[PDB]
Amino acid sequence: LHRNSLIVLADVALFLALYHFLPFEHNVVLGISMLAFIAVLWLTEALHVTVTAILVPVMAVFFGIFETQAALNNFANSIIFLFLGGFALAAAMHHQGLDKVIADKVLAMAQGKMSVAVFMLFGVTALLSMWISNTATAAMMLPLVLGVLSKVDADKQRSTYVFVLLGVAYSASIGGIATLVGTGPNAIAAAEVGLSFTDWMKFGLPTAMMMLPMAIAILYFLLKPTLNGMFELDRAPVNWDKGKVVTLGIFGLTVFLWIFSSPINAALGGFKSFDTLVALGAILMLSFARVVHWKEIQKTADWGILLLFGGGLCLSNVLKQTGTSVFLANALSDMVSHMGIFVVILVVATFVVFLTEFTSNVATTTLLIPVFATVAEAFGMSPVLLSVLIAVAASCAFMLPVATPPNAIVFASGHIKQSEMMRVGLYLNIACIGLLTAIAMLFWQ
Amino acid sequence: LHRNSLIVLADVALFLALYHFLPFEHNVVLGISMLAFIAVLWLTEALHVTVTAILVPVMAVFFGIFETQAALNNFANSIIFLFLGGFALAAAMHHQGLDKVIADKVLAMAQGKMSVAVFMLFGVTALLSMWISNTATAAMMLPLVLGVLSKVDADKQRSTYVFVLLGVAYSASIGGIATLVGTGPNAIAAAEVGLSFTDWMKFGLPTAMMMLPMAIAILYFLLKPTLNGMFELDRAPVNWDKGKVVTLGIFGLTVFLWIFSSPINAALGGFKSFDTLVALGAILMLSFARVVHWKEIQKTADWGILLLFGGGLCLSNVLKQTGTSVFLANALSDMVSHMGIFVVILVVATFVVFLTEFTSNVATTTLLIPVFATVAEAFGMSPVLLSVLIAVAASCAFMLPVATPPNAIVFASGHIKQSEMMRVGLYLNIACIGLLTAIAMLFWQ
Ligand code: NA
Ligand code: NA
Ligand code: NA
Ligand code: NA
């Protein structure tokens, strides 16, 4: 009866059709049929992204691709735990309120000017996003933005107070592209290609550094009348209490180890997934130091995403084992050799940047990274480039809401028009396809 | 400064002491020192049970027992997922309110009599517990019990209304010993020795059937004046709405497959952890049938316990790999051969039944099952017996509150005295040590 129940039934039909009708060696048919099936379910979101994630192994197993345990093992991948460590680290500084104090301390640095208020609102949203989340950083910033944009209250004077709402909802998404914790895609890239925390920062941070000015410049150079206004610093001020200095201390130590993971680990006897251990060491320090309880981390942790990661890793392995990765590489062989590597990464960059407007950031990365990385490997090229690219571009959701929760959060502010966001995003999208294809060309040799 | 911070520091000291001072082959020292360290942390609960669980792998890995990934893989064990399926199945019938309707439908079967009210209150709490939880079934029953015990309101007439409060808090714990979903210990036993869902029901259900009458008989034959009273059926009645019949349908189908897993799987081509698949198939059916959203399952699921499971599995493997399992078997060799198998299981049964009053149900099972099962295997005996026994006896917490949340829930009802519970539990404990040692002897050949 429901829309989504039909999409599912239509998909079951599609699979059954592809399964019986495709003219290839059995394994490839199965792999293709599965790929299409999952592809739909994550794009349409007829079933919750995570339910789909769980579906991958159960299928794999039933269609004899893997044994039950072999398939589930995917879910305990070390990056998944690294991300859990990220969730715990966030949970700590939110419950501690260290996110609030970094907001006030930097926001009250601006004396009483709306000019240097919003520019410091974007700079904080981005810096906080690096470690916390997007969905979380946005919902946490909304009250702080509405507080400031209440002096220039005139909402007949909209474009003063739309530049700042849409400003943070992008700064949350751009701040995610900074480190391996922050947004899902980055994790799925790292898990697929085997990146360290300090590896994904070498890519992402430059890109975030580049993109945030480029994004504000585009919002600015539409309709900004914000060089005017005054402040209302209205609420109780903040102060470092029982180890908000300790949470920062652990955080600092954790981030330190993460950056210097390469020499620290090497000069420690080279432990296997060192970053994940650092992330668990975080969980342990944070608990021994009593600074955050567990019930907090259980609420903060998005187990749905943690599960999703594994569902997609499983998929990747389904593609390899069935030889679907190699079959597609053969199929694309003529096309990709006729295309330049510029052409390819331009097409890839464009495809996602717009496909991410329709669908969930992760859901698409969980779909695309496996297909692309594994096919790239069949061609005997380094799957890293394409993967990192997909992961970044997936977080380039700037057009409509429903693209990312940060978009839908500043939108529910019953003010910003559908039409408005759609065309700033349309510019920013293209702006990015440039910047990415540009940077992706520079990170080659 | 805090109590627990010192316990931890004292433990760090203890480890360091055992590590440097024990006079054995390196591996055994390491294994022993670890075993002791963890043993403390789970018994004292100086760090949250789950934080300790995470500590196992991080140790294992740092002390070169396992590689980082190999260690984490423990957490994706198929039973862990089977339990997640249980959490989803529960989440469904609670959000759907199918737990409420099974309460009313059976409670309103009793026309207006307190005699057949409380006897049907225990029978429901136990039946609901089989699938839901203990902590959850208890907190869900408390309002339904206080509703009934408001006609015989006279709390100078306490022992009418203490027999029923303490009655359900035991019926929740006894109902847990029925199936593989229900309480943690049962899962940790199944994961350790490789039990099917239908395997742990062959043990547990008879034991629950036996124990519930035996427990009420002991509460009854203390201070019961409840053959008197009348009903106040006060609140809106219940009715089967949008697929409360569907939730029951899936539930029924799931439970059906679980029981008949053996012939269904065998006549299907023998898939590996069939029960876990059935449990995931539950999650999928429940979502396709739209009957429960995911955000619900993420709230219901105790990820803390799911993580704990893996922490203990890891431990077990730490014990094997270091040969600590074999070293202890050699150490106990003279003692256990001097003891009868009766003597042994009597000592085991007694030890836990009382140790579970001081500590968390799971925490102790996660500690003891590994030690006992792996040592039992070194003796070349079937680790099943001792394990099942420990898992059951761990859920025999009847004395003080803080033993189980169900105990602490009916206690916060600002009525039942410390002294009262402590001596009913003291009888019921001994009563069980009999029943278990009795049954455990019968389940031999
Ligand atoms: Na982020
Ligand atoms: Na998106
Ligand atoms: Na239970
Ligand atoms: Na207990």
Residue numbers in the entry:
A (entry chain B), B (entry chain A): 18 to 462
Provide excerpts from the study.
Membrane transporters belonging to the ubiquitous divalent anion/Na+ symporter (DASS) family move Krebs cycle intermediates or sulphate across the cell membrane typically by utilizing the preexisting Na+ gradient. However, like other well-characterized bacterial DASS proteins, VcINDY is known to transport succinate and other C4-dicarboxylates, rather than citrate (C6-tricarboxylate)1319. Our structure reveals a homodimeric arrangement, with each VcINDY protomer comprising eleven membrane-spanning helices (TM1–TM11), two re-entrant helix-turn-helix hairpins (HPin and HPout) and two interfacial helices (H4c and H9c). Viewed in parallel to the membrane, the VcINDY dimer is shaped like an inverted bowl with its concave mouth facing the cytoplasm, allowing the aqueous solution to reach the midpoint of the membrane.
To validate this idea as well as to gain new insights into the mechanism of human DASS, we replaced eight amino acids surrounding the citrate-binding cleft by their counterparts in NaCT, which primarily transports citrate6. We crystallized this octuple mutant of VcINDY, denoted MT5, in complex with citrate and determined the crystal structure. Although the MT5 structure remains similar to that of VcINDY, one important difference centres on the pro-S carboxylate of the bound citrate. Specifically, the side-chain hydroxyl of S200T and the backbone amide of P201G in MT5 each donate an H-bond to the pro-S carboxylate, whereas the side chain of T379V makes van der Waals interactions with the citrate. In contrast to that in VcINDY, the pro-S carboxylate latches onto the amino ends of TM5b and the second helix in HPout in MT5, with its putative negative charge stabilized by the positive helix dipoles (crystallization pH∼7). Since NaCT transports the trianionic citrate6, our structure may foretell the interactions between NaCT and its bound substrate. Specifically, 95 mM citrate reduced the succinate transport rate by <20% in VcINDY, whereas a mere 10 mM citrate decreased the transport rate by >40% in MT5 (at pH 7.4). Since VcINDY and MT5 were inserted into the liposome membrane in presumably two orientations, our data suggested that the membrane-embedded MT5 interacts with trianionic citrate more strongly than VcINDY in both the inward- and outward-facing states. This stark difference is likely attributed to the altered pose of the pro-S carboxylate seen in MT5. In support of this notion, the temperature factors for the bound citrate in MT5 are lower than those in VcINDY, arguing that the citrate was more firmly bound to MT5 than VcINDY at pH∼7. On the other hand, given the amino-acid sequence similarity between VcINDY and NaCT as well as the homologue swap mutations carried by MT5, MT5 likely recapitulates the substrate-binding properties of NaCT considerably.
